[PDB]
Enzyme design. Structure first.
Site, short mmCIF file in Angstrom:
data_model
loop_
_atom_site.label_atom_id
_atom_site.label_comp_id
_atom_site.label_asym_id
_atom_site.label_seq_id
_atom_site.Cartn_x
_atom_site.Cartn_y
_atom_site.Cartn_z
N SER B 152 0.86 -1.18 0.00
CA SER B 152 0.00 0.00 0.00
C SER B 152 0.90 1.24 0.00
CB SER B 152 -0.87 0.00 1.26
OG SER B 152 -1.60 1.21 1.41
N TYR B 165 -2.12 -1.29 10.22
CA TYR B 165 -2.11 -1.55 8.79
C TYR B 165 -0.84 -1.04 8.12
CZ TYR B 165 -3.83 -1.51 3.92
OH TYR B 165 -4.02 -1.68 2.57
N1 LIG Z 1 -8.64 -1.38 -2.22
C1 LIG Z 1 -7.61 -0.54 -2.13
O1 LIG Z 1 -7.67 0.80 -2.43
C2 LIG Z 1 -6.23 -1.03 -1.69
C3 LIG Z 1 -5.15 -0.14 -1.66
C4 LIG Z 1 -3.87 -0.58 -1.27
C5 LIG Z 1 -3.72 -1.90 -0.90
N2 LIG Z 1 -4.78 -2.76 -0.94
C6 LIG Z 1 -4.57 -4.17 -0.55
O2 LIG Z 1 -5.22 -4.99 -1.53
C7 LIG Z 1 -5.51 -6.24 -0.98
C8 LIG Z 1 -6.94 -6.57 -1.36
O3 LIG Z 1 -7.76 -5.65 -0.68
P1 LIG Z 1 -9.22 -5.27 -1.19
O4 LIG Z 1 -9.24 -3.80 -1.29
O5 LIG Z 1 -9.62 -6.16 -2.32
O6 LIG Z 1 -10.02 -5.68 0.09
P2 LIG Z 1 -11.33 -6.56 0.30
O7 LIG Z 1 -12.38 -6.26 -0.67
O8 LIG Z 1 -11.72 -6.40 1.72
O9 LIG Z 1 -10.81 -8.04 0.21
C9 LIG Z 1 -9.98 -8.58 1.19
C10 LIG Z 1 -9.87 -10.07 0.91
O10 LIG Z 1 -9.01 -10.57 1.92
C11 LIG Z 1 -9.65 -11.62 2.56
N3 LIG Z 1 -9.44 -11.75 3.99
C12 LIG Z 1 -9.56 -10.82 4.98
N4 LIG Z 1 -9.32 -11.43 6.16
C13 LIG Z 1 -9.06 -12.74 5.92
C14 LIG Z 1 -8.76 -13.81 6.74
N5 LIG Z 1 -8.69 -13.64 8.07
N6 LIG Z 1 -8.53 -15.06 6.18
C15 LIG Z 1 -8.61 -15.24 4.82
N7 LIG Z 1 -8.91 -14.17 3.99
C16 LIG Z 1 -9.14 -12.95 4.56
C17 LIG Z 1 -11.15 -11.29 2.44
O11 LIG Z 1 -12.03 -12.35 2.72
P3 LIG Z 1 -13.66 -12.21 2.87
O12 LIG Z 1 -14.34 -12.23 1.54
O13 LIG Z 1 -14.16 -13.36 3.64
O14 LIG Z 1 -14.02 -10.96 3.62
C18 LIG Z 1 -11.21 -10.80 1.02
O15 LIG Z 1 -11.32 -11.89 0.13
C19 LIG Z 1 -5.23 -6.13 0.52
O16 LIG Z 1 -3.97 -6.75 0.82
C20 LIG Z 1 -5.15 -4.63 0.74
O17 LIG Z 1 -4.33 -4.28 1.83
C21 LIG Z 1 -6.04 -2.35 -1.32
#
Ligand SMILES: NC(=O)c1ccc[n+]([C@@H]2O[C@H](COP(=O)([O-])OP(=O)(O)OC[C@H]3O[C@@H](n4cnc5c(N)ncnc54)[C@H](OP(=O)(O)O)[C@@H]3O)[C@@H](O)[C@H]2O)c1
Ligand SMILES: NC(=O)c1ccc[n+]([C@@H]2O[C@H](COP(=O)([O-])OP(=O)(O)OC[C@H]3O[C@@H](n4cnc5c(N)ncnc54)[C@H](OP(=O)(O)O)[C@@H]3O)[C@@H](O)[C@H]2O)c1
Ligand SMILES: [Cl-]
Lengths: 252, 253
Positions: B152, B165
């Site tokens: 991130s 985080y």
């Molecule tokens: N979106 C952004 O702007 C952004 C920016 C920078 C970095 N990121 C990074 O991108 C990655 C994806 O994030 P996202 O934005 O797609 O978030 P998201 O929509 O919340 O998806 C998170 C995923 O991680 C899984 N997860 C969370 N806790 C878990 C656990 N305890 N065991 C197994 N799986 C778990 C979730 O499972 P569930 O379906 O069960 O909830 C979901 O499939 C993350 O590493 C995040 O830090 C995102």
């Protein structure tokens, strides 16, 4: 190049973790030599009592010590230490988070998962919990200084340094978040990267290294003094190298 | 980033995606399958995983397998059991995308809940490490394996209120660099991707006043995801890539 007056830290109350050996021990002794009221934190009572007696022999005032094992301390076990400190002191002008666990030096494929978790617990989680517990005291200072301890591997990961390198990167992250939160407030927050220094942790990390090729904890104290004294009051959110020109890695 | 590979880029590539049940991971899973990969879906919610698998099955006519593994509650043994299950069915892993992550709560350090702090570190760092360790043997059976962690903007520069985080994302970068260094003379490349502000629920949780329609969707940032898993990135290791290099970090304006 930094030679402060012998009373630089007169009337400053400074807490040092990992005060029982190595760099933290030297920091405690040095801060006391520069006039500070030092508080010693560690896990080994006999080692802490020894450092405190060394300081009492020189300053003619017995500094207080507190035992706290960062590996096993629960959330509440850190706040208890802050309450004990608060009972004897009105503020903290400085907090040096020097305590650290090396863990295992070896490839990621072999890293013991429990040891990995212990390294993260001591260096990151408990360091955070202790920080949270001590912030109220730090905010009572006119210009408090919070210092975390990184490593060369906290800025550039290196093979076989697994949990330790990961924890030092984390340390720098944590410091930057805190520095930003307290930017315009009374507290400054920075990291010190000591560089390869003559201690038992370093000897364990590089068993073939000749420790006589390294600087001693005493040699790297100028930066330690500078960050706790008034000359660094406008500096926050930085990682400072105690040995800027030192070639990273094993001494040649 | 104008990468537009052939639709068969990942044919005969076995790729595992964590957090494959929603957001970026879900899109990565669907996209890798569309480009020919044999996708393995990891998540904690069985029903969500099944739906994504079915969605891929509807288009590719080949239903991919999914495995449940809760990163917040798993032990080293549970990671090895999943790697053992995978090894039983597949001869190698050509790619591993560590996409799963927990945000925790936005707030100052003085107010951070220590249990949530530990949860964030457990999912993002400790469990991610344990799973990595369990999957290394399979990754090393690939002719050119690709291991990808997710960072991130706050994993490069810490900012106020990002607490656990930001700390966990710094850790992620460190872990990635250690691994890259260890495998530089072997067949495995290790890198990080910073997706940038992308329209997902975690992003909405991080910025409750942000208009999500001003963000790129997970679909829009896929080119970098494909690039890192295909042969065109085989000489790159130890680097952290931004999916949205022309975007100023922070809330969408
Ligand atoms: N979106 C952004 O702007 C952004 C920016 C920078 C970095 N990121 C990074 O991108 C990655 C994806 O994030 P996202 O934005 O797609 O978030 P998201 O929509 O919340 O998806 C998170 C995923 O991680 C899984 N997860 C969370 N806790 C878990 C656990 N305890 N065991 C197994 N799986 C778990 C979730 O499972 P569930 O379906 O069960 O909830 C979901 O499939 C993350 O590493 C995040 O830090 C995102
Ligand atoms: N020496 C170097 O080349 C070097 C280089 C870069 C960074 N550093 C950093 O410098 C700091 C000091 O290390 P050092 O080289 O002086 O090593 P050291 O002599 O081993 O001292 C480490 C200190 O941390 C304390 N400690 C370890 N685990 C603890 C726990 N669970 N609870 C409370 N205290 C604990 C130790 O207490 P005990 O006395 O009971 O063992 C000891 O006082 C560390 O953060 C280290 O990562 C050192
Ligand atoms: Cl199975």
């Amino acid at each position: 190049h930094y030679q402060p007056k012998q009373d630089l830290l007169q009337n400053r109350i400074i807490l040092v973790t990992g005060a029982s050996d190595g760099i933290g021990r030297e920091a405690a002794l040095t801060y006391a030599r520069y006039g500070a009221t030092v508080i010693l934190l560690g896990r080994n009572e006999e080692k802490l009592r020894r450092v405190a007696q060394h300081i009492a022999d020189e300053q003619h005032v017995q500094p207080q010590w507190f035992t706290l094992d960062l590996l096993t301390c629960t959330a509440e076990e850190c706040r208890q230490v802050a309450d004990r400190i608060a009972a004897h002191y009105p503020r903290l002008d400085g907090v040096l988070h020097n305590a650290g666990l090396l863990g295992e030096i070896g490839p990621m494929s072999e890293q013991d998962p429990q040891i990995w978790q212990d390294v993260m617990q001591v260096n990151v989680n408990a360091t955070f919990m202790l920080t949270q517990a001590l912030l109220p005291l730090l905010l009572k200072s006119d210009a408090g200084s919070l210092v975390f301890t990184s490593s060369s591997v906290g800025r550039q990961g290196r093979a076989n340094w697994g949990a330790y390198a990961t924890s030092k990167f984390a340390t720098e992250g944590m410091m930057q978040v805190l520095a930003d939160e307290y930017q315009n407030r009374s507290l400054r927050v920075n990291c010190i990267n000591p560089g390869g220094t003559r201690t038992s942790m370093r000897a364990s990390a590089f068993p073939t290294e000749d420790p006589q090729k390294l600087k001693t904890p005493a040699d790297i104290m100028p930066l330690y003094l500078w960050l706790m004294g008034d000359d660094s009051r406008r500096k926050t959110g930085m990682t400072f190298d105690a040995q800027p020109g030192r070639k990273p890695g094993i001494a040649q």
